[PDB]
Design an enzyme around this catalytic site. Structure first.
Site, PDB file in Angstrom:
ATOM      1  N   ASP A  64      -9.239  36.799 -36.562  1.00  0.00           N
ATOM      2  CA  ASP A  64     -10.541  36.222 -36.263  1.00  0.00           C
ATOM      3  C   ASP A  64     -11.142  37.079 -35.162  1.00  0.00           C
ATOM      4  O   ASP A  64     -10.912  36.823 -33.984  1.00  0.00           O
ATOM      5  CB  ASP A  64     -10.397  34.774 -35.776  1.00  0.00           C
ATOM      6  CG  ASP A  64     -11.748  34.097 -35.546  1.00  0.00           C
ATOM      7  OD1 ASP A  64     -12.782  34.689 -35.915  1.00  0.00           O
ATOM      8  OD2 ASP A  64     -11.783  32.969 -35.006  1.00  0.00           O
ATOM      9  N   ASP A 124     -10.800  31.495 -30.946  1.00  0.00           N
ATOM     10  CA  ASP A 124     -10.330  32.539 -31.863  1.00  0.00           C
ATOM     11  C   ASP A 124      -8.851  32.404 -32.254  1.00  0.00           C
ATOM     12  O   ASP A 124      -8.493  32.598 -33.414  1.00  0.00           O
ATOM     13  CB  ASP A 124     -10.553  33.906 -31.212  1.00  0.00           C
ATOM     14  CG  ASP A 124      -9.873  34.018 -29.843  1.00  0.00           C
ATOM     15  OD1 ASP A 124      -9.972  33.062 -29.038  1.00  0.00           O
ATOM     16  OD2 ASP A 124      -9.245  35.061 -29.567  1.00  0.00           O
ATOM     17  N   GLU A 132     -11.326  37.687 -40.900  1.00  0.00           N
ATOM     18  CA  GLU A 132     -12.535  36.874 -40.983  1.00  0.00           C
ATOM     19  C   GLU A 132     -13.761  37.762 -40.856  1.00  0.00           C
ATOM     20  O   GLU A 132     -13.830  38.599 -39.961  1.00  0.00           O
ATOM     21  CB  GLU A 132     -12.558  35.803 -39.910  1.00  0.00           C
ATOM     22  CG  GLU A 132     -13.732  34.859 -40.028  1.00  0.00           C
ATOM     23  CD  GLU A 132     -13.664  33.729 -39.021  1.00  0.00           C
ATOM     24  OE1 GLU A 132     -12.570  33.109 -38.873  1.00  0.00           O
ATOM     25  OE2 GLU A 132     -14.715  33.456 -38.392  1.00  0.00           O
ATOM     26  N   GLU A 165       0.863  -1.178   0.000  1.00  0.00           N
ATOM     27  CA  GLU A 165       0.000   0.000   0.000  1.00  0.00           C
ATOM     28  C   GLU A 165       0.899   1.227   0.000  1.00  0.00           C
ATOM     29  O   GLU A 165       1.688   1.416   0.931  1.00  0.00           O
ATOM     30  CB  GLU A 165      -0.936  -0.003   1.205  1.00  0.00           C
ATOM     31  CG  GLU A 165      -2.230  -0.768   0.996  1.00  0.00           C
ATOM     32  CD  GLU A 165      -3.380   0.133   0.603  1.00  0.00           C
ATOM     33  OE1 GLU A 165      -4.505  -0.381   0.430  1.00  0.00           O
ATOM     34  OE2 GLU A 165      -3.161   1.354   0.470  1.00  0.00           O
TER      35      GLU A 165
END
Ligand code: ADP
Ligand code: BEF
Ligand code: MG
Ligand code: ZN
Ligand code: ZN
Lengths: 104, 585, 670
Positions: free
Chosen positions: B400, B568, B472, B291
């Site tokens: 953009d 963008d 754009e 463990e």
């Protein structure tokens, strides 16, 4: 158990004639699986090692695989693969040099 | 062992001794037969196929052979038994016989090594006990899960290299065969030899069902090798289970133990290998840390110290829950590591790649851009200011725009890219946010792009003959035109400036904006292919005014790009590159 | 303990013969580049060896023919490939050397042998010819043959026997031309970026730090279908070997060594076009690489001049091999085209070292590079322990962003930097080093042909030997079939048995290639099928319909009366597989219900792909109801075979197209 090389030794006798006269005959026993030594001496003085011979055999192969891809097939997808591999290796070696130039 | 007891097979040959080599099992062959893995990996497996015992060939393997490696048809064997070679060179027969029998004697001597008898008594006994699914048999099947086989490989390939060091290659091949994983690149088998490996199994998948047979059989087969073990909450179930199975399938007179402490297995000699338990807090060679997500300090020190040893392989097999999957102790280790920890997960990285690993789930219990390409991208940047000869003389800039403020998707994306060799490189990036209620949003955006361009131009003087600009217009054609007009005018204060133009449907007018529609899918598709193959990079002196007060611009772009399946900047970058029909003056 | 089983001596003899044939096909690949004036001298040896191979593949032709039809093996496949390719190249080289001395042309002989004008003989068609449509692809590369073989193993439960044997013959005919050389694997057919079937099996098994396996198969060079062979070549190679040459007069050898001693007394210019960042003036890495390449060029040119001189001394003729007769096309290639191919006096390892002695110099990062094991060790230790203003501002921000970038490259990202540098070095080594071949293609070819030929051999072998009581010709078998169907459509699946149906279903939908369940370290059929299903890239909307195909009075009676294994109506590769899964699930659930209702005997629902042959020609098909995957005779029930196991005179079997007809005939006969 007589060997094939001490069986037939004479002029050209195109290979199929020998096959017909000596080994295709059913009355034979087909012993003697001893091969011969075909690599010459003029090819051992300059490549005197199976490693060097293999390296030369690979270099000429890599050259032939470039001359055949350099009638208008013009695609030959193997040719496009061989161009893509070269244009990838160029960029990869250039970036491998440039990155260690930058690491300093 | 059958193929090791084969006679000489005279087998004369013409190659000179300066070249010939001695392959085992067969006579002396030319050196080329040692370079070709087509014949080498066959003449090497048909021999090691005899060291493998009869209980490790498989469930259905044939009568008395591994029929998928050594099977000759009842007609080919009768047609081969009538083949006879040159058989001799009287001055050269004795040395070849000596060499062949010497190599085969090396092999036979390997067959008789006590340390190899122990490894056999281990793997054979394991594959035999597994037939009953590890019941209490004194000594419908018990198939291993994948990780329950990786743990076994990690233990066996280690104890093989530790107990049998003088037989590295031969034992490596023998184990490759016995695990039925031949033709494995030696890099993987070498990776198995490493120490301090970490596992992460989900609960109820089976980790203690397989450990205690592994522990018991790594005790009873090998001799004199201790076995560590540690857990936080005082190991008693695993300890009692080991006691039970060991006393079951071995003489209970052999086992000797004190509760919660050392278990020892007897032997005819005084070997007496032990399982001393370190849960309650020398040479261990296993140190099974059961463990590893709950440890308390002053107990990690023994584990950090055993790493200083050269014979211990600390196996961190530790359970997970998926309610705490990101364990504060191990799941962070996957960051800076290389072939160290292997998770056992069925819901992978994303929220639902489960359909991929679905068939991989136990039956009992019933990302467009590659990370490597992203790491390579950010990791290596070319210096454009000093390799200008590699650049194409044209800059491509895509804008953009978003014409709102006080929104997270109100950012304007700008990218300035060019050709670098035959690849694409980014010179500048902007993720620009309008000031609220400006009277001049297009000019504010234009001033942003002009400032970016200028910096790129100044960093590479005389490099560029043309800059081509696309704005754009999907959002607003008029607003896009206004941006182009301001860029046009401001740039008027060398390189020629050209705008992409668009003739909208039903119109004869050529507007200086770009309409993104049918070309999106091709642009994205090409980008993804180029990016993934290492063909898109960022300039080492990449410019960004807007990404300069919180994050690295390339790092920021990559975060957007990793959303491929606010965009963008991603769109501007992908489209600027796609641009790099004719655009004009 | 003296006598060893005759098959072992025959296998040793076959290994020796394979070695001899490989040596012969190496001499052949040498004489394809040697000077024709020397090929004419070695003509009798080549003719004798061609006669030897001809007389050899006639003593083994019936043997190998019977072998192909009964459980192929990697040894037999490799021997067939090497014998056939050696025969082919022997005849071709002899013809091309006898064509010479009629033309007397060397360049023509080289354009013939080395194949400079051949029309790309590395194309082939397959025409898989499954049920529900015949999908045909085109083998071009090696990984394409591997992909087709995995595709055939995947869609093995639909394609018939004879179609599979035809496709496998048309694949072996391509392997004869590709894997036939077995030593040099021409670069026209190799794409190491495509991981083969074992890269996936060794990526599932090795460590995976998160990183779903689909995200690791993109960076691997796969290193298995084309190995590297690590060739090394000394510096003064011929000078070491000229004193002890074979068949040389001492006077000639002495004067040759004298001429050698006397004569011992790339495109670097195209480096400046490469993208070289960093400081331009000073000791850089591109200039160091240029100097290393210039030194290697000097060594190679010196070796070439020495070789020409010593050949002029010993034999008196400057021999013309394929690197001196085509030196015009050579010596004009760019830097990259001279790096990929070149160095007949160096080795690709010398090029790797000439690059790395230039990269790694005088420097943290090198420590992680040289020993990543100690790096992961310290990582585990740490885890356990825990316009004018525009120009000026542009210069300032580029300064403060180069500084930050270098700070990242020295402090963080070292995991990514190490991984990327290792992967770049691997992509270099795999490109430069001499790829010889791999052992994956014949292994997979044998593993698939074994299953298909086993299905065919069981179909042909249970033909007679006893009563062959057929239920495909139906006199009244409707009367006894509908009754059994109604008698089995009555009970519940008893979900306490689903952990057995879910295993005996994947044990049948699987293929013969990936065993992974009979390894003696067997894994469940889950992973044994996940391998054969994920390797052949399957749509994720189909991968869940494998696992969840049993969790659910229908859905186990989807077959019609006579057409159980019949896909006459449907067409395609996905719907054909879906109907196959429906029919197999129906067979399994029917067998389970028949066991849970009737206590006559056991069926165990076996497959013919099992039952590997014993030491010689014995198969011992055990009793049970088989699947046989044959749309002409799907269900074959062996009610009782023999005391020994083999299908003998008392081995009454029952053919049937109808699953319930088999389940009734078994009860009637048992
Ligand atoms: N492939 C398997 N082989 C054998 N037992 C398995 C397998 N898969 C699941 N099991 C079962 O799972 C259980 C193992 O659980 P265990 O390992 O003790 O869980 P934990 O990981 O919580 O300690 C056993 O009942 C075992 O039979
Ligand atoms: F699956 Be557990 F450790 F209750
Ligand atoms: Mg428990
Ligand atoms: Zn082609
Ligand atoms: Zn591979």
């Amino acid at each position: 158990l007589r060997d094939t090389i001490p069986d037939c030794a004479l002029r050209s006798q195109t290979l199929e004639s020998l096959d017909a006269r000596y080994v295709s005959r059913d009355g034979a026993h087909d012993a003697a699986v001893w091969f011969e030594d075909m690599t010459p001496a003029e090819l051992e003085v300059v490549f005197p090692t199976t490693d060097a011979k293999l390296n030369y055999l690979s270099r000429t192969q890599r050259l032939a695989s470039l001359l055949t891809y350099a009638t208008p097939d013009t695609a030959c997808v193997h040719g496009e693969l061989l161009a893509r591999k070269r244009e990838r290796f160029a960029a990869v070696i250039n970036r491998f040099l440039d990155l260690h130039q930058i690491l300093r | 062992g059958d193929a090791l007891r084969v006679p000489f097979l005279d087998f004369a040959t013409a190659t000179p001794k300066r070249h010939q080599t001695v392959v085992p099992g067969v006579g002396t062959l030319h050196d080329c037969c040692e370079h070709s893995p087509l014949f080498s990996a066959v003449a090497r497996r048909l021999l090691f196929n005899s060291l493998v015992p009869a209980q490790l060939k498989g469930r259905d393997f044939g009568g008395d052979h591994t029929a998928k490696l050594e099977f000759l048809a009842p007609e080919l064997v009768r047609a081969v038994a009538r083949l006879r070679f040159k058989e001799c060179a009287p001055a050269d027969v004795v040395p070849q016989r000596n060499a062949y029998y010497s190599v085969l004697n090396t092999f036979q001597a390997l067959h008789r090594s006590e340390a190899f008898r122990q490894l056999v008594h281990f793997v054979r006994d394991f594959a035999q006990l597994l037939k009953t699914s590890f019941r209490a048999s004194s000594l419908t099947y018990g198939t291993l899960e994948l990780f329950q086989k990786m743990i076994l490989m990690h233990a066996t390939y280690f104890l093989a290299a530790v107990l049998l060091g003088d037989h590295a290659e031969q034992v490596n091949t023998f184990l490759r065969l016995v695990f039925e994983i031949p033709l494995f690149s030696d890099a993987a088998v070498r990776h198995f030899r490493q120490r301090a490996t970490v596992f992460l199994v989900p609960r109820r998948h089976g980790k203690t069902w397989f450990l205690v047979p592994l522990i018991a059989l790594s005790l009873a087969s090998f001799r004199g090798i201790k076995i560590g073990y540690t857990a936080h909450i005082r190991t008693e179930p695993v300890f009692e289970e080991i006691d039970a199975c060991l006393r079951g399938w071995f003489g209970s007179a052999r086992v000797d133990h004190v509760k919660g402490e050392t278990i020892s297995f007897s032997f005819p000699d005084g070997s007496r290998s032990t399982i001393v338990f370190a849960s309650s807090h020398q040479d261990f060679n296993l140190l099974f840390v059961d463990e590893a997500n709950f440890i308390r300090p002053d107990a990690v020190q023994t584990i950090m110290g055993f790493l200083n040893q050269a014979n211990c392989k600390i196996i961190f097999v530790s359970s997970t829950n998926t309610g705490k999957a990101s364990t504060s102790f191990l799941y962070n280790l996957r960051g800076a590591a290389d072939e160290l920890l292997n998770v056992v997960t069925y819901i992978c990285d994303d929220h639902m790649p489960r359909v991929v690993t679905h068939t991989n789930a136990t039956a009992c219990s019933c990302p467009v851009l590659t990370k490597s390409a992203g790491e390579r991208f950010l990791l290596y940047r070319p210096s454009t200011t000093t390799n200008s000869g590699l650049m194409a003389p044209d800059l491509y800039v895509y804008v953009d725009p978003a014409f709102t403020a006080n929104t997270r998707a109100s950012g304007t994306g700008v990218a300035v890219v060019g050709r670098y060799r035959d690849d694409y490189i980014i010179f500048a990036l902007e993720h620009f946010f309008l000031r609220a209620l400006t009277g001049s949003a297009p000019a504010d955006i234009a001033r942003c792009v002009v400032h970016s361009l200028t910096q790129v131009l100044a960093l590479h003087p005389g490099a560029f003959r043309g800059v081509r600009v696309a704005v754009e217009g999907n959002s607003s054609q008029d607003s896009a035109v206004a941006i182009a007009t301001h860029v046009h005018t401001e740039m008027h204060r060398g390189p020629e400036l050209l705008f992409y133009h668009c003739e909208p449907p039903g119109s004869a007018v050529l507007y200086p904006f770009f309409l993104l529609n049918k070309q999106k899918t091709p642009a994205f598709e090409h980008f993804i292919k180029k990016f993934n193959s290492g063909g898109v990079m960022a300039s080492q002196e990449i410019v960004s005014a807007t990404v300069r007060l919180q994050t690295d611009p390339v790092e920021y772009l990559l975060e957007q790009l990793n959303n491929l399946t606010s965009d963008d900047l991603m769109v501007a970058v992908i489209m600027a590159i796609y641009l790099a029909g004719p655009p004009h003056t | 303990a003296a006598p060893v089983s005759e098959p072992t001596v025959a296998r040793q003899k076959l290994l020796a013969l394979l070695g001899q044939v490989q040596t012969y096909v190496f001499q052949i690949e040498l004489l394809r580049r040697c000077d024709p004036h020397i090929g004419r001298g070695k003509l009798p040896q080549l003719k004798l060896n061609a006669l030897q191979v001809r007389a050899l593949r006639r003593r083994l032709r019936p043997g190998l023919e019977a072998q192909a039809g009964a459980f192929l093996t990697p040894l037999s496949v490799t021997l067939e490939l090497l014998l056939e390719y050696a025969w082919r190249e022997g005849e071709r080289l002899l013809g091309s050397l006898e064509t010479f001395a009629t033309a007397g042309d060397v360049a023509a002989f080289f354009t013939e042998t080395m194949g400079l004008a051949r029309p790309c003989p590395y194309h082939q068609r397959v025409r898989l010819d499954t049920y529900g449509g015949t999908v045909h692809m085109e083998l071009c590369f090696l990984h394409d043959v591997e992909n087709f073989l995995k595709q055939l193993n995947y869609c093995h439960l639909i394609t018939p026997s004879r179609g599979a044997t035809a496709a496998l013959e048309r694949v072996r005919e391509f392997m004869v031309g590709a894997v036939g050389s077995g030593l040099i694997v021409p670069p026209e057919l190799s794409d190491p970026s495509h991981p083969c079937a074992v890269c996936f099996e060794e990526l599932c098994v090795t460590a995976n730090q998160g990183a779903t396996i689909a995200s690791r198969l993109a960076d691997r060079i796969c290193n298995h279908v084309t190995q590297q062979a690590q060739v090394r070549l000394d510096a003064n190679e011929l000078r070491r070997y000229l004193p002890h040459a074979a068949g040389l007069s001492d006077a000639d050898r002495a004067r040759a060594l004298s001429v050698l001693d006397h004569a011992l007394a790339y495109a670097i210019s195209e480096l400046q076009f490469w993208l070289a960042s960093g400081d331009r003036a000073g000791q850089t890495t591109m200039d160091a690489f240029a100097s290393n390449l210039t030194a290697l060029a000097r060594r190679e040119l010196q070796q070439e001049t020495a070789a020409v001189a010593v050949e002029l001394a010993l034999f008196g003729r400057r021999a013309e091999h394929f690197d001196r007769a085509f030196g015009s096309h050579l010596a004009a290639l760019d830097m990259v085209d001279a790096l990929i191919i070149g160095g007949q006096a160096t080795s690709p390892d010398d090029q790797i070292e000439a690059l790395i002695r230039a990269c790694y110099d005088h420097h943290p990062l090198l420590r992680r590079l040289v020993s990543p094991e100690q790096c992961d060790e310290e990582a585990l230790r740490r885890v356990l322990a825990r316009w004018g203003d525009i120009a000026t501002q542009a210069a300032a921000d580029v300064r403060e962003r180069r500084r930050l970038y270098a700070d990242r490259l020295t402090k963080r990202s070292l995991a990514s930097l190490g991984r990327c540098v290792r992967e770049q070095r691997g992509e270099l080594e795999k490109m430069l080093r001499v790829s010889v071949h791999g052992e994956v293609l014949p292994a997979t070819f044998a593993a698939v042909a074994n299953g298909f030929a086993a299905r065919a051999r069981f179909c042909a072998l249970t033909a007679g030997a006893g009563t062959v009581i057929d239920n495909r010709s139906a006199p009244g078998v409707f009367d006894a079939h509908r009754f059994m169907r109604a008698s089995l459509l009555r009970h519940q699946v008893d979900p306490a048995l689903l952990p057995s149906i879910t295993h005996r279903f994947f044990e049948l939908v699987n293929g013969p290639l990936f065993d992974h369940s009979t390894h003696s370290f067997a894994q469940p059929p889950n992973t044994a099928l996940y391998y054969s299903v994920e390797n052949v890239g399957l749509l994720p909307h189909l991968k869940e319909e494998l696992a969840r195909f049993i969790m659910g009075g229908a859905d186990w009676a989807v077959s019609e009366f006579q057409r159980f294994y019949c896909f006459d109506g449907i067409s395609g590769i996905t719907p054909t597989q879906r109907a196959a899964w429906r029919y197999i699930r129906e067979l399994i659930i029917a067998t389970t219900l028949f066991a849970s209702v009737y206590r006559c005997g056991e069926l165990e629902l076996r497959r013919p792909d099992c039952s590997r042959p014993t030491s010689e020609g014995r198969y011992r098909y055990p009793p049970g109801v088989y699947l046989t995957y044959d749309s002409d005779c799907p269900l074959v029930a062996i009610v009782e075979s023999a005391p020994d196991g083999c299908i003998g005179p008392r081995s009454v079997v029952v053919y049937d197209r109808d699953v319930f007809s088999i389940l009734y005939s078994v009860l009637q006969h048992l």
